[PDB]
């Protein structure tokens, strides 16, 4: 279990 | 890949510790649960379950006014009692919205080679921190929006790896302790080894109180959390 | 209450057994369950046996009420030899009530634990003169020992401590850690590493060919 | 979790949260009755004498105001319209605590309390302010007791086994049955350590007031 | 002569009882207002456990414990008492316990040493079990008395009876009120303790002025 | 007549302690002087003025980028050199609403009894207490009401009274001392006999300083208190 | 660097002065001290003078450095006889290195002196054995001391002290108490009250009565 | 009293409060210099490892920054619109400070700072709740140094007397023209303390990012 | 034989030089290892303080202080050595100082003697002196030696160079810190420190290395 | 100096 928040490559 | 999913996390902390909560929580309308994963949630449900019912088997009568005043129990459990991971938290009798009762916890998901004896044994500003946010879900404008706020920028409590040991021949258990202080870590180490400990303010009254299990506590015994069954005033 | 500290076992300066300090009810089964240690590792090394023991390291040790007689006993022991040269250990010991608290022992100050393996390797120099020993470890203070955070067994699964603070509940986990056991520990010989050694009950005759080589 | 009863300076008549009657109705009475004790006494040094009265820490054994022990601070108060009671911040400890480690243990709690209770004689003065902060009150730092024993009917036997679990045995004894009052004192009264076996007899209520 | 402070008492360390390298009753360093009430209280002791245990009696009194005390002033003359008394023997086979005592002024703290340190009397139990080994020099142990130190020991916290029984202290902080308190406790009591023995356990008591005749075989006995 | 004047005052503490400020304050136009008699104000406003004099005639054309980068300075002063009382105390350079430089003090005014080796020997918290009262008179929108309000409300710090001694013959002093502590509180004031004391944070750097001067300190050596003249870095 | 404490004077088993562990730097500065106030009391008490000196108190005392010689010295001292009856006191002395605070030995624990005292008087009983004494004295431990904290006059008028805590603000305080001085205290005697006495300096001849009798 | 330099979560290029040139400027310096280097070595590796690294406690003998000594905490850090610098709160303590008192003393003051460091990355996150906590922050305690000299070019002596002051004597020494960095470490690198003569050579970096 | 733990090094406490009651070097418990470039050592910087003294020497050489010592490893050996030197001499009248040395195993913690306790050490120096006083049984000096303990010293702090130049320790707390501080100060050192004297002053002192010949004359001399 | 504030006697 890894989980966080936010995301850094765009999502075009 | 880590720069797909999240973003700093500066300590990288949510690789070395998953902290979250799970229960019923007064602003909600049933069994609430985020931050843990689920190998812990399943067995930890499972478990309250039994000692919910079992607990009520006992006390007949008694056990809602038992219940309502129950103490909050902190807790260190060793690893594979619950899957992997060891396991240290809060528990605190609890409510949901549409008066259901179940209890709520704040839980902290720790490697299996986790020093218990630390935790157990270490400072209770923690378990204190945690005691607050749960007892203020309780109050009356209590903004369920801020316990889940603090829950997640909870930081996992301090706690170093412990002194590697290893069971030669079935009677001999050897530790790599080689100072005083080395051999201390490596006893308290050793007592929470398959065992889980609850300690707290007793409610009751002049306190808890450490108690060991060996495993987790048995299905007739949950009833000792909700009430009473030190010296000694001649 | 004869002297804090007392010694069993086989003087370089002396010809047979030697004992001051050390009531009956520890020295019948220490002596037992050391000779059936000598034997037994003497059969599993075979030729080897004589070697390993010349070399061994001293052990200090910490050994719950009960199993050597009703009080807990710490002390250190080391490999000797008397006047004509039969092969024996030489054990410092100190009684400690039944309510005294091993986990601060075996985690605590070295500093007695040191001296008492000083003044048993001083019996193995030239010319030691016996009394010298047996005066200094007659004078020798109890090493720092309080009494155990009190327990109850309960129902068979449960186990209360009327520890309420932080260092309490530390101090009753290592304790329990102790209780039934002995352990053992120092700073190693040349083939076995400096560690610590727990077992429940006094080791069995077949391990104690550990005390003296690691493989 | 901590309450108090008595009379505060911008509330009408009386004021009590957080305290059982099993200990209201016996600590109310006992400072009433000590009040017309001291005024006989005093005459009139009296009013001058109680305005500037100290404020007392007590520690009060099971028995005597009900079947827990209290321990707090009681300062000379006064209502809304000038009529004068005193104001008694207090933590109900039942039983089996160890009064010793309190009355000999940190001032910090006590310090607070003393700290919250003038601070209602302040102009400005909130009276919401005052029962916000003493219901955030923790209570005070109490340990469990040393086993005890009466034997015989002369003898006292404790488990003590070294010089701190003796010390504090005595003290503990020290504490049992009795009820200490201690705190800074005035102008007229040094500080100091009073103590009574029970609480002290109305004719006595005027030393807490003044001193010789 | 010279008297270095006007009095022979607190100066210091004294003894009384049997010693078994002596004849008679060995003494040094104590008045007779201790010696005399303390060897009164001794001896009737001594008969009560003799009547209430019968044969078991020598064979309890050759192995009880040695028990450390600390004694309020009033109950063996005017001074408070502190020190440590053993079952002793003489050189003819006769038994009486040997006392290391020393006297202390009226308003000595007697909680601080009930509640202190535990040297000086582990130093004293040292000395009185070296009177009864075989090589034993009589000598060595006057010399080593005459050389102890007296217990630490200083004033209790000023104290008076106002209003016929509110009692007031002179304590203005924590440790000062922990004091003032643990003397209460031991005003007109004497208290005792030990190591014990192997018959009885560790523990502290406290009784009203001197323990009563029929108590003494709890010293002796579980 | 106590009750014809005031009415509770709890601990009588306006008979045992006057506390108060004097001095400029930034918000007011000029000196200001609120809970000090006035056997201490003339004393201490001669001697402050007279080493701000001293000290303009030192430092030249430097004073005043000294005088407004000085430190704060905590001090206690034995009896008599101010007149009557015993007085402790922190005075800071402050400024008032015309732009006119002055030091703003709060000073504690005690019997000439009290044991000012506990207070020069004590913990620090009054003087913090008192510290930031003052630094937060300077502040753009400080509220002059507020400064005034808190000072009145401001607790005389802890000060017992002192060994008792007794000077026979002018070579020998007696103290009434028979414990090590009563002792070691003996020396501590003697130290402070006819005394005064300075020390504080020191601002220029790593810190003051315990300072004592016999009496008042002179004129020409007030330029001390507000620059340099600890080691040392190999 | 010789025994960490000393002694000087009379004792009831020997003929004359006598004198171990301690320089000459100290022992005639000291003799000298002593011997004028043992003269300058005899003409002011005249045939009082027997009488008090046989009950004075025993004197623990603390001595600023540069007043017997550079070091700082502290003991006890104890009115004392010699085998052939005469009078002169018996005094244990630690010399202390100059940084030495004696504020701290003032106001520091009693364990020290009181067994300085309690070996003082052994030497007055029946047949104390000499040889005890000395031994005893040369096992003695030098008593607890630290360096003083740093200080420095300035200009004549103002003393700088290093002190940075509450703590050292107190010990730099008390420091500064001792320096230049001599401290003495004790139990009394039945005509002097226990308390404790400062002098600036040794104290004159003509004060040394007041270590005999109060008036 | 205490400040700050870098890159804050909610504003726009580089922020700075607080702290002189004298140190702002080689601070900078040899954080980018550093940045740059990691790259080189880390390659694709590098931002994932930037994203999860710790944060590092340093103390920084006099010298190396400017005149004065400087001790702080530095955390990988991010502006509004999403570039990547560290930001650091660091306090000026000039020259005669014992550093050894400050890396081997009470962590309290540094996790404050680390506190509101993480506070920054919070959603949120006031960006003035920070400046102002910042300005509020008290120096760290740092004591006087032991005096110290080098005689003849082999020989250091220290005006130590007693094990206590021996004890600060050495550490004293080994902080000497040197930088520390300490702190909890990240999922990579464990706790830990490193030294460096100097500040750490731009190849370096890259271990205070990921650990082997 | 017998050696209990496969070596006679660390077990533990020696000595070597000269002493009063014995003809020529005295040696007892020390390896080769450590004899050898001590004496070396030693002699060494007789020789330099005599030439650089001339006639002072002898009177400086009386009257010096007892130093005590910490030493890196690689020194004098691959073990670290912790100890005591004092201005000696023998039955005929040849001057040497006596040292009581304890090598410690490489990893010893240095630091923590250095800055640590006393007790060792000022017991060291009460052996050391009585070997001066006229009564001096020199049976009773090696009965002492072999019965001291060795000094309270656990293991440094483990520690690695990483990135060429960038040390690296595991230090997690501040104790761990400061010690790991402390011993950093003591690599590829030898300290030196005592009670000093009347002519030299107390404090410490840090060589690199082995003090060089010419700086022998600081020991005796201020 | 005992100053301090307010006053209880009725002042008609």
Known sequence: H???SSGL???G
């Open 9 to 11: 490559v765009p999502r």
């Open 2 to 4: 890894h989980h966080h």
